[PDB]
Amino acid sequence: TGRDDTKETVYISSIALLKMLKHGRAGVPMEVMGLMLGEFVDDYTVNVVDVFAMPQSGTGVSVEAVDDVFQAKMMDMLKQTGRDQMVVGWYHSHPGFGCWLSSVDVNTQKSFEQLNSRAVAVVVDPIQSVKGKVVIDAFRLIDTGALINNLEPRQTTSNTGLLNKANIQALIHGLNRHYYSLNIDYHKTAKETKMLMNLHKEQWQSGLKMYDYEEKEESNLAATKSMVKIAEQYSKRIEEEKELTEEELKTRYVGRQDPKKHLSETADETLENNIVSVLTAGVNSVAIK
Amino acid sequence: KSKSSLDGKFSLFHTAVSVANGFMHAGTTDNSFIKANLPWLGKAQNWAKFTATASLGVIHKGNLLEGKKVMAPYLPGSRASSRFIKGGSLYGLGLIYAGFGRDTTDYLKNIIVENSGTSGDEDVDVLLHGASLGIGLAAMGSANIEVYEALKEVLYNDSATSGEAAALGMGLCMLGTGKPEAIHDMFTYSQETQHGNITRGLAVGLALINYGRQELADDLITKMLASDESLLRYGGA
Amino acid sequence: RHLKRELKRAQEEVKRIQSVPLVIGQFLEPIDQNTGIVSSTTGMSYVVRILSTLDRELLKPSMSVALHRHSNALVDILPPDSDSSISVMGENEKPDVTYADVGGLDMQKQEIREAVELPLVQADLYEQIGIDPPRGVLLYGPPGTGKTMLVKAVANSTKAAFIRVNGSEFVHKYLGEGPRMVRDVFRLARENAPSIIFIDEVDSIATKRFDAQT
Amino acid sequence: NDKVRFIKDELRLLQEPGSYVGEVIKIVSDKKVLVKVQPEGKYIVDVAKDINVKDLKASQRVCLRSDSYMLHKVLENKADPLVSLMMVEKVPDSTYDMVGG
Amino acid sequence: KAAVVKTSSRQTVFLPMVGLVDPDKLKPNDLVGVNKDSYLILDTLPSEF
Amino acid sequence: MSLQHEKVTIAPLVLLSALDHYERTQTKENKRCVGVILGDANSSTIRVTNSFALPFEEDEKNSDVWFLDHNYIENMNEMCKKINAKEKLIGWYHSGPKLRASDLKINELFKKYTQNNPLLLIVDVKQQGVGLPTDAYVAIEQVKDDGTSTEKTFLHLPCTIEAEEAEEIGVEHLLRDVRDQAAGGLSIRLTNQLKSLKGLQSKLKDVVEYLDKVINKELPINHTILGKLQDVFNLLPNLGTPDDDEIDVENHDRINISNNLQKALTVKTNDELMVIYISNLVRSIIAFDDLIENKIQN
Amino acid sequence: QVFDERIKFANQLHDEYLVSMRYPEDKKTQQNEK
Amino acid sequence: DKTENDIKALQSIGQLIGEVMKELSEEKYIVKASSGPRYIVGVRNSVDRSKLKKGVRVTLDITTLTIMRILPRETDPLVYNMTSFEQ
Amino acid sequence: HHTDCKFIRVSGAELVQKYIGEGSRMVRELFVMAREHAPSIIFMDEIDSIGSTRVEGSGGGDSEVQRTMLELLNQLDGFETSKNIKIIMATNRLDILDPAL
Ligand SMILES: Nc1ncnc2c1ncn2[C@@H]1O[C@H](COP(=O)(O)OP(=O)(O)NP(=O)(O)O)[C@@H](O)[C@H]1O
Ligand SMILES: [Mg+2]
């Protein structure tokens, strides 16, 4: 019968993830562009080793803006280093709207389907993302033909599928009738993790430096006064507070913005701090002489 | 119910009906389901059609003698219309013949050696996935080393989806032996393979082979949990 | 102990959302204790989640409010004091204390003190006799008698709040833009009481006869 | 355990951009309602699936989503400037003997 | 060097003066072309009254 | 040249690039990867944005013998200018770890390109030193005393990382670790106090053995070090001083304040004791009433 | 020396609170309630 | 050099102007944008807290909405024309 | 106080309101809102000293918006039949008031 037609779990390296973020953010508002370099093996494995952002084009995402002079040139330099990788798709940002292929972009992505048969269009939306995690999705062309010939069920085998409910109407219609969405995973080695994880030794050298000690008194003093003012409302609150029905009590004795909670919070902050302050002061003194 | 509500063209639905029904009629042959749900059956495609032939073996569990007979047109040689049929019959045979006779293991063993080259042809990848699950089932608790060697050759070929099937198949055959040479090879290979399905297969196989292995699996557990891969930790557990 | 770390990290995440960038809106009325309706600066009416443990006592009175930009939700509240009416760039506060306000018209300087300084400073006195707080003060005379300066001096050194506005702040070219500032002055004073209201230009605003010719 | 869920859950709610507020002008025979989205123009937009057109009435103020504008929940209390004005003015405490003669 | 444009998009933008476009040629209340994405003074336009 | 070099901030991106590049050029058996570093310069903060490997060969037999490809440096410049124009050629990274005297010689070719003293960014690839995964060093030319010829030498500068906004935000989603230091709760910093002492102790012992090595193994005496150690003995608090007595007073106050905060927490914990009891008392009645009512109904 | 002890006494209070507190609650959760 | 100057501006990208509507804190400032909607923004570290004064014209990122720097007073044309005369 | 109704002071023109839409027709819309929020005493304070020129003139769009409100009290007769909306007006002088009253 038919081929599996299971969209690739797109293993987008940590290096590729950070790198789309830089180009895309700085380049606001102009919708940026570039190719994704990687390797496709098996039926559902693409690893995107690296990406590179093509020079800005004032035309915006267009068939104009995809260009082979840049394509050739970067790859020829990577020949010299042996870091050469084939074009396996393209990324761009729509930052002025969420992650979904435009009517113009579906024509464009089809050109790339001729180049490479497992070509992706990965829309990275940089302004609207607040963390570089949410509103980022991956796509791959599903023909017009598929829609007519009821071949969409073949297309979603061996997958869990991803729906983006938000953004509808039009946009959603186009999305459903153009591409297929699948989960995006981030792969990294643990040598990378250790780098990410790393800081310095001057990190702890700073952690042995001590503030001026009058300022520390200021904080201890302040806390005591701080807590006096909120201890009156707490004092008032528990005078009676026996009256039937909890919901009523919450308005009457101000159980919202809870004074009991707020007192324990301030006490506890100042307390953990003053244990570190006495400890550090003693450690330094005995250590040195 | 199955025909009326659940749609046969949609693949996920069709898998659910095939599995529920396979059990309904299990442990005695039944062709009642084929006949009732005949139009329904023609709709099938892709992996819905692999599951459709393998369903037959869950149904036909027991009645061992007539197990082979019914599966006769679907085998390779007698079928080359559809690779999903060819492959899902061999999985299907192995269900009936789970833990029973070793005359069956022999047949499947031939098919593995034939295709342990290039699984790069499209038909071959599907075929060889079923063959590999199939022979593992058939050889359960035999501790046939011949089987084990055959499924190594699939692994090292680095067949796309059959790599997983083979890895599982080893642990089902050699069930509970804790042969150390087997343990060493699997564990080491799983690091090399970058493709996750093959990796999952070997993680889980390492557990199977150490069935009832008690405190002699203790060497294995420390390595798998400490392995930085999430995959090996999952099978570690 | 494992769940303590999750909890702590869970609060940290919410602080990023709470943080800048933000956009100002104006909390309208409740629809419900824990869901309310707001209007933005952009005229759009958003029905928004009231995040847990926030202000309620004052939140429900139409009051100025902040909205997280990307969530378009009520993540934290502003004082009514925030977003003060259109008001003079320099200090309300008087930088001089040397004062010629003392040396000559001294009798009038005490009088102003009597009406204005004496209730705020000593509330106690008033409570015992039983009077209502003394009534407003109109200052009129020929100009070049330092009227706007004798009273300024007092506000400055009493160190009760001082709101110094002109009719020129209020005046507007639009439709209904003047009055919305006027409502803000009266309330703004109540919020931050004891409080001193002085409108320097009021002459211009008052007319002998009303007209609508233009 | 319960507390950490609540903090997380609130965060997940806030995510949804927009969310609006209209008023049903009328009910129509395809099972849609004509909404006047209060700042924006008019839109004809379906009822939520959960509530039927029998439940709704003329001039019902409603909440609205923003990703499809499909109705969310009916407003418990009518959004109108007048409501806020009452709040401020407060319940009269004055009586006839406050003013003598 | 710097330019305050008030756009026809009804926005107000403080943009780095493009160095290619001369400081001389430019003047207050010159009519000018401006790039559509990123707001920079792209070119100068015959004025209309 | 510019002497402005004060801090060198290094994006998490440069590090990821350099690792990857080292392993894709399959430079091994202490085959050096030498690649270019791009970013801003002639600033107090040098903002190190990116790196790309250059073709490179290093021969183990003799270290004078290496290749570096001139034209590649040139080709990259017009490409990188278009991509982001704030980038300039600023020097080269070395795989390290070792600090070579072949780096004086490589710096001289980079010195042709650069408008600053060539920035040598030693990005350790083995990551043995967990802390300091980076060293930064700038080529200077300075009058060497004792009637010796002017020397070109490497003076350490702060290589410490700061990160850009765009990079940082994604990194933070990935991790959830308590890292080397987060300064989190009490637990986290309490660990820190032990670790940090241990940092110092390590540092300190090495200074002790360095002094043996001057007089046993005849290192040329680096007088700079000796200068710093004089400042340590001299600005060393002296004990028996009445300053120490003052210190003890400050200690007395804070330990007291802790005691008063401890008591206030007792009042909070004590309130919870009663409220839960109140609740139990009502519930006893709720459950009793179930039993009697089930009997009556039946 | 004096103050060190006073802290320990408060802590000992807290513990006494915590243990006792939970013993009625067991009873009630186990009992049926309306 | 002249043509290279355009490449460099392109990466700079435009900015939005408001004005310091009211100081509330050193940490956070309330600005009212000239085009419209009032925003609460953050301060950048090189710009000083005291350069910031009420009524000073400020420039801010479009993207992050964070006060980059003070601008000189960007006078209305009417008062700009009176200054402009040298007789 | 004794009547026990919602005493909503609306002081002045509702051209001050500008929250949604123009404030002009919000004057007129008062009827609708008072009905929903009954029991209500609408205390319309408005002296009508916005110009003597338009008190005695034919000019004045303020006069037009005012007028459309008065008509709603006698076309719709929502307030009259089931009285719970009292229309309490207050002007300093009987003689500076609009003559349609
Ligand atoms: N305590 C005072 N006694 C006498 N004259 C005063 C006093 N204080 C200020 N002056 C004088 O008043 C002049 C103007 O002060 P100013 O504040 O303008 O007054 P005013 O009466 O409010 N009138 P106007 O300028 O019309 O608002 C000064 O130039 C002083 O000479
Ligand atoms: Mg005056």
Q: Which residues contact C129 (CB under 8 A, 6 or more apart)?
A: none
Sheet with I85-90, side-by-side order of all strands: I6-11, I40-45, I85-90
Q: Which helix (H) or strand (E) holds F133?
A: none
DSSP state of A43: T
Return the best residue to mutate from C106, C139, C145 for the ligand 1 pocket (most ligand atoms within 8 A of CB).
C145
Alpha helices in A116-258 (DSSP H): 144-149, 152-155, 169-176, 190-197, 202-205, 214-237, 246-252
Planar angle of CA C61, C64, C68, nearest 5 degrees? 120
| Alpha carbon separation from F96 to F27, F135, I15 (Å, rounded) | 12, 10, 74
Question: Which other chains touch chain D, taking contact as 3+ CB pairs less than 8 Å apart?
Answer: A, C, I
Q: Which helix (H) or strand (E) holds C37?
A: strand C35-40
Q: Give Dmax over CA atoms of chain D in angstroms.
A: 67
Looking at chain H, after which residues does the C atom sit over 2.5 Å from the next written N, breaking the chain?
none
Backbone conformation region of residue A266, classed left if phi is above 0, alpha if psi is from -120 to 50, else beta = alpha
Question: Beta E2-6 vs E12-16: how paired, if at all?
Answer: antiparallel
Cα F115 from Cα F118, distance rounded (Å): 8
| Alpha carbon separation from C29 to A133, F8, I22 (Å, rounded) | 35, 53, 20
Which residue of H lies nearest to A32 if distances are taken between CA atoms? H11
- Compute the half-sphere exposure of residue A248: CA atoms within 13 Å on the CB side of its CA: 5
Question: Which other chains touch chain A, taking contact as 3+ CB pairs less than 8 Å apart?
Answer: B, C, D, E, F, H
- Structure tokens belonging to residue E21: 């476009």
Cα F176 from Cα F160, distance rounded (Å): 22
- Structure tokens belonging to residue C107: 């009798």
Query: Is H in contact with A (3 or more beta carbon pairs below 8 Å)?
Result: yes
Cα A2 from Cα B45, distance rounded (Å): 7
Work out the minimum CA distance from H12 to partner chain F, whole angstroms.
9
- Asked if residues A12 and A186 have their Cβ atoms less than 8 Å apart, the reply is yes
- Structure tokens belonging to residue F24: 């894709």
Q: Which residues contact A49 (CB under 8 A, 6 or more apart)?
A: A13, A15, A16, A37, A38, A39, A85, F20, F24
Residues paired with residue C197 on neighbouring β-strands, in sequence order: C163
Q: Which of C28, C175, C212 sits opposite I51 (nearest CB)?
A: C212
Cα E18 from Cα E15, distance rounded (Å): 8
| Closest listed residue to residue A15, CA positions, set A68, A51, A41 | A51
- Asked if residues I6 and I39 have their Cβ atoms less than 8 Å apart, the reply is yes
- Structure tokens belonging to residue H46: 């090189």
- Structure tokens belonging to residue A249: 């009590």
Which amino acid is it at I93? R
Q: What is the total residue count of chain G?
A: 34
Alpha helices in chain A (DSSP H): 14-26, 68-81, 103-115, 144-149, 152-155, 169-176, 190-197, 202-205, 214-237, 246-252, 259-288
Subunit contact A28:H63, Cβ cutoff 8 A = yes
Sign of the Cα pseudo-torsion (F194, F200, F206, F208, in order): negative
| Closest listed residue to residue F260, CA positions, set A274, A204, I61 | A274
Question: Beta H66-70 vs H38-43: how paired, if at all?
Answer: parallel
C142 CA closest ligand 1 atom index = 21
- Compute the half-sphere exposure of residue G3: CA atoms within 13 Å on the CB side of its CA: 13
Question: Beta I40-45 vs I6-11: how paired, if at all?
Answer: parallel
Sign of the Cα pseudo-torsion (A154, A160, A162, A165, in order): positive
| Closest listed residue to residue F117, CA positions, set F18, F7, F9, F41 | F41
Cα D24 from Cα D57, distance rounded (Å): 8
Subunit contact H7:F82, Cβ cutoff 8 A = yes
Name the method of structure determination: cryo-EM
Looking at chain B, after which residues does the C atom sit over 2.5 Å from the next written N, breaking the chain?
none
| Closest listed residue to residue G27, CA positions, set I19, B98, F286 | F286
Return the best residue to mutate from C105, C108, C110, C149 for the ligand 1 pocket (most ligand atoms within 8 A of CB).
C149
Which amino acid is it at B197? N
- Structure tokens belonging to residue B236: 């570690």
Cα A124 from Cα A128, distance rounded (Å): 10
Cα H8 from Cα H16, distance rounded (Å): 19
DSSP state of A177: T
Backbone conformation region of residue F158, classed left if phi is above 0, alpha if psi is from -120 to 50, else beta = beta
Q: Which residues contact C71 (CB under 8 A, 6 or more apart)?
A: C17, D14, D15, D16, D17
- Structure tokens belonging to residue C33: 């204790």
Cα A150 from Cα A124, distance rounded (Å): 30
Work out the minimum CA distance from H86 to partner chain A, whole angstroms.
41
Subunit contact C84:H64, Cβ cutoff 8 A = no
| Preceding amide of F97 cis, omega within 30 | yes
C109 CA closest ligand 1 atom index = 1
Q: Helix, strand or coil for residue B30?
A: coil
Cα C66 from Cα H28, distance rounded (Å): 13
Which amino acid is it at B100? F
Mutation pick from A22, A23, A28, A130 vs chain H, by most beta carbons of H within 10 Å, is A28
Which residue of I lies nearest to C176 if distances are taken between CA atoms? I16
Which amino acid is it at A194? K
Question: Distance between terminal CA atoms of chain I?
Answer: 27
- Structure tokens belonging to residue D33: 């309602």
| Alpha carbon separation from A56 to E39, H9, I87 (Å, rounded) | 14, 12, 67
Please list every residue in chain D whose beta carbon sits closer than 8 Å to the beta carbon of residue C75.
Answer: 14
Cα A35 from Cα A58, distance rounded (Å): 17
Given CB atoms, is C26 within the 8 Å cutoff of chain H?
no
- φ/ψ of C177, rounded to 5, equals -80, -35
User: What b/e readout covers F58-67, taking b as 16+ CB neighbours within 10 angstroms?
Assistant: beeeeeeeee
